[PDB]
């Protein structure tokens, strides 16, 4: 669940990044939506006073997304045998009731 | 009916006696009892009145506590104000 | 018997029903028990008919604060006022200055005993105070402030121990109060009086960082009741969200309320609930982001179209909210590094509006578009931060808050290393101060990424 | 060598970022929760963007300008 | 409740049903003291 | 020597659940049924 939430937040950031790229690079609602959705995913995985804020917002995005990932990694430790035994019973009884 | 006849003056507010009389007043309230003490504002009677007032303040929705104070008219200090001029006497 | 601290002998012989005495007959003996630190005798005289409120006259308090006040304690108080000043510290300093050169005399005596770390005397005096939870919390705050002075670490440790003791006392007393009554305890929670600087139980607990008092179930459910407003917490969250999206369903009885009224009080109570207001603000922020994206992608034609003016008005209301946050939080607002981001995003929006208003200029229009895209990224980052905080609003908030600062420091160190790497590359590859600075700053970021 | 040293120091800083919250329980996060929720509850509690009217009214007003509980306690 | 439960026929089932009912009643936030008492009784009957 | 099974008649149970049942407890039970309903909660509500 934690990694799923982190990936959802990354997808929201990717949508924002695609909107920004389309507003910067380019100037057809379906074409605009397709470009916004599929531009950052293909780009990442395949002008004087704007560079410093660009670096700053990249740093802020890295900070928030990395913190979400670390929360995903470490959140299960916040909140012993009985819990996992209950979960084991739940799963095994769910399969045995078929 | 509880007839409390104790020290008329110079009552030590020891924790044991405080607890004893608080429990007594609580029992009287729970059982719907009357407490017959003296009307004087001294010693044990003063503490009984204080505990009765505290119980009434704490539990307003519970049963009221009856604390009859049987005193002597010949020993009341600030008299001449209890006589009628419906009428409320400011003691 | 008092000079030798023989309490049992005094109780057995002096104070007996056979003997007679008056409350005013032991005034001087009470004074000398107070100044000689005989808490048992203070308690004995208090429970033997003496009235503390009438005994604590202005002359008695002045003598206690002038002649029987430690000079080391006064020096520590002065150091605290100069270095760790606070509202309660200022109030106590003013009180001490008044008594050195209603009025709550019992509070003054309690402060006199608290400042000098007279633990048992302070407990005896505190048992006679009117607002006892407030007195305990104020003592905890004052003692925690005095523990900050490093002139004498033994005195600071004693102050910290006494502060913990009084915090525990306040917690236990308020737990008893809440177990007895819930509405009366909550009235006592927000009770304010000029006794402790016009402060409050919750305010004093927060200022003193009394985590045990704040973490009380009574305080926590009081906060939950405040958060839900007039909406009962027994209603489901999805029901509240659905009534938020479907406004007419609020008056149809879908959402239960704590109290009862006119078909207008229901909507007023619903839409003034902090839970509802928060959810509505998040929804309207998402809608504003959608409008921003629409304007950027399809409504940029070198003239402000009505969507642009609507977006400008929404940003103006956001700026008003940010100004209110500035005014409320003072200079401490620009410490979270995420409030700074919101302020900088609003300023960047203002700059982009200025650039965009300069029509008949392709360069100005392109600069405005680029600034607006960067600000769209900033606003979505703010929404992502809101989502992150709301998801981890619980035991994981500590980890989240620590991780944010730690990753920020790591990224700052990476930026320092990147500046060094750019300087090295420029000194190796290349041989105009502005051009050199631009190359140094923007070479490693483009090269590595 | 300097690339290895830079990787070492930056990676150690990242790992410190990951693991530092564990060095130093319910009361702490409850206090933080109270702080955040009380900070939000202390606002005007007017839905956006209708809060601008409340702000204007407040600024206009600014420009123009017990024993029972204690006994129970 | 303990005295009555000592007389029940299905005692484990009664204890588990009491635990379930008390945990459900502890969800009501109208009175948190009553909810806490219900939670404590539910834990006691689960232990039983 | 008293037998609880025979003592617990329908009249006794009705008097206990009608006159000696707290109104606050009944309100909490109603809130639970409306908000945190369950199979056992429904069964207990029907019994009451
Ligand atoms: C850039 C382009 C424009 C932007 C587009 C962005 C789109 C974003 C749109 C939507 C995503 C919203 C995500 C919010 C996540 C944060 C909240 C969270 O985790 O906690 C909540 C998760 O429970 C929910 O609030 C579930 C929300 C489900 C929404 C389903 C899709 C709706 C469309 C609730 O937490 P909890 O612990 O259950 O609360 C305590 C419960 N208690 C009070 C009873 C004690
Ligand atoms: C478009 C609007 C109209 C109604 C809205 C829905 C109304 C109610 C909800 C329930 C809501 O769920 C909760 O808040 C549950 C929280 C919880 O119990 O943890 C999530 C958003 C959602 C699906 C809304 C999503 C956006 C919708 C579909
Ligand atoms: C416009 C479309 C895309 C729908 C968007 C829906 C969200 C904006 C809503 C749906 C459910 C809402 C949540 C429902 C419940 C809560 C719990 C609520 O209580 C707390 O966590 C406060 C702290 C605490 O009480 O412990 C805080 C708001 C939050 C996260 C809400 C935040 C806003 C959410 C995610
Ligand atoms: C755009 C700035 C990137 C800085 C370095 C981020 C490193 C993240 C490592 C995650 C394992
Ligand atoms: C330039 C030397 C690089 C060595 C490997 C570094 C790997 C770092 C992994 C961080 C997740
Ligand atoms: Na990134
Ligand atoms: Na990342
Ligand atoms: Na490197
Ligand atoms: Na690295």
Author numbering:
A (entry chain A): 865 to 891, 895 to 913, 952 to 984, 990 to 1008
B (entry chain A): 145 to 229, 235 to 240
C (entry chain D): 433 to 533, 557 to 716, 722 to 891, 895 to 912
D (entry chain D): 961 to 984, 990 to 1030, 1049 to 1056
E (entry chain A): 577 to 624
F (entry chain A): 481 to 528
Question: What's the publication's text?
Answer:
TRPM8 is a non-selective cation channel permeable to both monovalent and divalent cations that is activated by multiple factors, such as temperature, voltage, pressure, and changes in osmolality. At 2.7 Å resolution, it is one of the two highest-resolution structures of any TRPM8 protein that is currently available. Overall, human TRPM8 adopts a characteristic homotetrameric arrangement and is very similar to previously described TRPM8 structures.
We determined a cryo-EM structure of apo HsTRPM8 that was solubilized with lauryl maltose neopentyl glycol (LMNG) and cholesteryl hemisuccinate (CHS). The pore is composed of helices S5 and S6 connected with a pore helix (PH). The lower gate of the channel is formed by hydrophobic side chains of M978 and F979 (both shown in Fig. 2a as sticks) that close the pore. In contrast, in our reconstruction, only the first two amino acids from the selectivity filter (F912 and G913) are resolved. The conformation of the pore in our structure is similar to the closed C0 MmTRPM812. In our structure, the S4-S5 linker is parallel to the S5 helix, and the S4 helix is fully α-helical. The quality of our EM map in this region allowed us to unambiguously assign them to two CHS molecules and a phospholipid with one monounsaturated fatty acid which we modeled as phosphatidylcholine (POPC). Importantly, we did not observe any density in the putative Ca2+-binding pocket between the S2 and S3 helices that could be assigned to the divalent ion, which further confirms that our structure is not in the desensitized state. To improve the quality of the reconstruction of this region we performed its focused refinement, followed by C4 symmetry expansion and subtraction of the signal from the rest of the TRPM8 molecule.
